[PDB]
Design an enzyme around this catalytic site. Structure first.
Site, PDB file in Angstrom:
ATOM      1  N   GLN A  90       0.818  -1.201   0.000  1.00 33.95           N
ATOM      2  CA  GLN A  90       0.000   0.000   0.000  1.00 33.95           C
ATOM      3  C   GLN A  90       0.857   1.258   0.000  1.00 33.95           C
ATOM      4  O   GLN A  90       1.978   1.276   0.510  1.00 33.95           O
ATOM      5  CB  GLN A  90      -0.926   0.015   1.212  1.00 33.95           C
ATOM      6  CG  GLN A  90      -2.011  -1.023   1.156  1.00 33.95           C
ATOM      7  CD  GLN A  90      -2.897  -1.000   2.375  1.00 33.95           C
ATOM      8  OE1 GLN A  90      -3.879  -0.261   2.427  1.00 33.95           O
ATOM      9  NE2 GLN A  90      -2.554  -1.800   3.372  1.00 33.95           N
ATOM     10  N   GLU A  91       0.300   2.323  -0.580  1.00 34.19           N
ATOM     11  CA  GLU A  91       0.935   3.638  -0.619  1.00 34.19           C
ATOM     12  C   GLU A  91       2.291   3.569  -1.328  1.00 34.19           C
ATOM     13  O   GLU A  91       3.324   3.979  -0.799  1.00 34.19           O
ATOM     14  CB  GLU A  91       1.080   4.213   0.794  1.00 34.19           C
ATOM     15  CG  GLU A  91      -0.215   4.712   1.408  1.00 34.19           C
ATOM     16  CD  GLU A  91      -0.694   6.014   0.800  1.00 34.19           C
ATOM     17  OE1 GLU A  91       0.125   6.722   0.179  1.00 34.19           O
ATOM     18  OE2 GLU A  91      -1.889   6.335   0.953  1.00 34.19           O
ATOM     19  N   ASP A  92       2.261   3.050  -2.550  1.00 36.60           N
ATOM     20  CA  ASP A  92       3.427   2.957  -3.421  1.00 36.60           C
ATOM     21  C   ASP A  92       4.501   2.027  -2.879  1.00 36.60           C
ATOM     22  O   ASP A  92       5.688   2.256  -3.107  1.00 36.60           O
ATOM     23  CB  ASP A  92       4.032   4.340  -3.687  1.00 36.60           C
ATOM     24  CG  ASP A  92       3.070   5.271  -4.386  1.00 36.60           C
ATOM     25  OD1 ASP A  92       2.338   4.801  -5.282  1.00 36.60           O
ATOM     26  OD2 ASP A  92       3.041   6.471  -4.043  1.00 36.60           O
ATOM     27  N   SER A  93       4.116   0.981  -2.165  1.00 39.34           N
ATOM     28  CA  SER A  93       5.045  -0.045  -1.721  1.00 39.34           C
ATOM     29  C   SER A  93       4.907  -1.281  -2.604  1.00 39.34           C
ATOM     30  O   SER A  93       3.959  -1.418  -3.381  1.00 39.34           O
ATOM     31  CB  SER A  93       4.795  -0.400  -0.257  1.00 39.34           C
ATOM     32  OG  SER A  93       5.682  -1.408   0.174  1.00 39.34           O
TER      33      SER A  93
END
Ligand SMILES: [Zn+2]
Ligand SMILES: [Zn+2]
Ligand SMILES: [Zn+2]
Lengths: 44, 49, 48, 49, 49, 49, 64, 242
Positions: free
Chosen positions: D7-10
């Site tokens: 999540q969140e560009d991971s």
């Protein structure tokens, strides 16, 4: 204390005091020889 | 299929080969901690040692 | 706390060694701070 | 959205693929040091103290 | 766009003017002294290098 | 130029390895004319200065 | 630089197929035909040889 | 200075920059070591000295040794009367000789603005003042440079080196300056090998009058073969040389 010449790749024993230079090539770039000590790698 | 349980995932996942790049930014190059470190003599304040 | 005469510098204070330290460079060659060099100049002219 | 760790560009990476050399890289750091005889009193040389 | 050439040509004229100024100063000292001057010695090679 | 002063071609890798500047010597032909108000003119040229 | 031993995705052996793959291409096989001849069915393994760059060949052009 | 351990060798610590008792653990001095800074982890002559050295392309270390010598003799001032350019040239020559790549006075007068006579005078004066000495030049010192200034190959260079070393060994050239012997040996190895050079070019490079080349070549003229290297290829028979 073996140094490998960068030009002709001649192994020559060089003392600390004497100048660093190929005995026969005259080249001025010297590479230390790989250590004789054993280092372990895990193939991971 | 779910790896943990083996059950089919209800949604069908978009999957295929994509060209990815590893960037120079590694976490090891960035992680750093300070705890009562080498302060400066003149300023008596923290500095890298 | 303040007087007009005190504005004139009759006696010059000398910062402690903590304020201006003796930096070490190129071995034991103590590198005196800029204040010491000015202090050295001040004392030389003062004595003269 | 597998387990919430992307999540969140991971990104979630395959550990087995990493074990096989996936995106393995080398890092070379080169250090240069020169010995200077400037100054009659001081003469720095290369030798193990 | 000033590329390497024109950028380098900008430096050379400033550095060549200093070279010509320097030989003028060196020669003037010897000419006033009454003795001819050596051209090789008048040129300061470090100016351009 | 080596310590003994022997010139040798400088390869770009050697410049990179030994921290040298990849520079080419610059020479200029200089013609010098001297007049001593004695109806004589001496013109001496220093080739490749 | 050199062909990986295993396919990253599944661990199938790929390190003994680069030379055969190059030989098959020299035999006028299409890249897809060569991969099928080599037993690479999953596109993860086909990716291994279809996208490999053999830099070790040019690294050997520098004398030790 | 552990209060419990008088006269204890405190161990420096880089974690915080403090000295700790070698066997107590007590930290003496909070962060006093200053780890970062400690562990690595008159004029117009230096201008003139560098101006000279650039004309020869000799490396900066020689120029640092030169500047050190100049500073030293400018403190001695036993040769205050000498011109500063003269002292600079003599220091340059002494440094070139000390490093082990000596040039000739004619290779410093060629750069400086003063005559070789003054260079030699101030050179002796400097060796006298500094109470130092310089090892005697040999013929093998001027060979890596003379044969390279000439377009001779490395084979001819080692050839002339061997010839000159053997000639000074076998006493063929008694009391003659090493530069003239070097020029003679280079002329021999050049006329013997593929690339031939006349006495004139070798005189220009070595700074030796061709008459001296002749004189010290006739001294090694008859013993030509036993001076040369045994394993030596050439296209002009060493049995015939002018
Ligand atoms: Zn070599
Ligand atoms: Zn696969
Ligand atoms: Zn203690």
């Amino acid at each position: 204390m073996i140094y490998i010449c960068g030009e002709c790749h001649t192994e020559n024993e060089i003392k600390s005091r004497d100048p660093i230079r190929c005995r026969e090539c005259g080249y001025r770039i010297m590479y230390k020889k790989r250590t004789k000590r054993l280092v372990v790698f895990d193939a991971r | 299929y779910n790896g943990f349980t083996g059950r089919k995932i209800t949604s069908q996942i978009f999957i295929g080969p994509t060209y990815y790049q590893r960037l120079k930014h590694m976490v090891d190059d960035k992680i750093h901690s300070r705890a009562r470190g080498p302060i400066q003599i003149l300023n008596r304040q923290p500095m890298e040692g | 706390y303040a007087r007009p005469e005190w504005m004139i510098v009759t006696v010059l204070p000398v910062p402690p060694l903590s304020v201006r330290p003796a930096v070490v460079m190129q071995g034991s060659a103590r590198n005196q701070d800029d204040l010491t060099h000015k202090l050295a100049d001040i004392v030389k002219i003062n004595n003269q | 959205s597998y387990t919430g760790y992307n999540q969140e560009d991971s990104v979630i990476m395959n550990r087995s693929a990493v074990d096989r050399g996936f995106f393995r890289s080398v890092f070379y750091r080169s250090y240069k040091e020169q010995e200077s005889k400037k100054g009659f009193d001081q003469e720095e040389v290369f030798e193990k103290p | 766009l000033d590329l390497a050439g024109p950028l380098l040509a900008f430096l050379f004229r400033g550095m060549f003017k200093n070279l010509l100024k320097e030989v003028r100063i060196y020669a003037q000292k010897f000419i006033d002294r009454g003795k001819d001057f050596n051209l090789e010695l008048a040129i300061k090679t470090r100016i351009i290098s | 130029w080596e310590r003994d002063g022997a010139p040798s071609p400088m390869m770009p890798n050697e410049a990179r390895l030994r921290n040298l500047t990849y520079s080419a010597p610059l020479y200029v032909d200089i013609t010098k004319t001297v007049i001593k108000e004695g109806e004589e003119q001496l013109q001496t040229q220093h080739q490749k200065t | 630089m050199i062909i990986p031993v295993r396919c990253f995705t599944c661990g199938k052996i790929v390190g003994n197929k680069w030379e055969a793959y190059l030989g098959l291409l020299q035999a006028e096989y299409t890249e897809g035909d060569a991969l099928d001849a080599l037993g690479l069915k999953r596109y993860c393994c086909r990716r291994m040889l279809l996208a490999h760059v053999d830099l070790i060949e040019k690294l050997l052009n520098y004398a030790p | 200075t552990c209060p419990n351990h008088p006269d204890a060798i405190l161990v420096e610590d880089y974690r915080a920059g403090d000295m700790i008792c070698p066997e107590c653990g007590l930290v003496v001095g909070d962060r006093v070591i200053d780890v970062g800074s400690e562990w690595r982890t008159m004029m117009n002559a230096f201008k003139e000295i560098t101006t000279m050295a650039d004309r020869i392309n000799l490396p900066r270390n020689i120029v640092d040794r030169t500047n050190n010598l100049f500073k030293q003799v400018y403190e001695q001032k036993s040769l205050k009367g000498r011109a500063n350019d003269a002292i600079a040239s003599a220091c340059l020559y002494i440094a070139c000789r000390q490093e082990g790549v000596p040039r000739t006075f004619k290779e410093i007068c060629a750069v400086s603005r003063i005559s070789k006579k003054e260079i030699g005078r101030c050179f002796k004066l400097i060796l006298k003042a500094l109470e130092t000495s310089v090892d005697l030049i040999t013929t093998g010192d001027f060979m890596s440079r003379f044969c390279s200034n000439l377009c001779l190959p490395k084979q001819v260079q080692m050839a002339a080196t061997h010839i000159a070393r053997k000639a000074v060994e076998l006493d063929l050239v008694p009391g003659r300056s090493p530069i003239s012997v070097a020029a003679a040996a280079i002329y021999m190895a050049s006329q013997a090998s593929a690339e031939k050079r006349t006495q004139k070019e070798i005189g220009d490079i070595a700074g030796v009058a061709d008459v001296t080349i002749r004189q010290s070549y006739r001294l090694i003229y008859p013993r030509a073969p036993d001076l040369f290297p045994t394993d030596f290829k050439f296209d002009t028979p060493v049995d015939k040389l002018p």
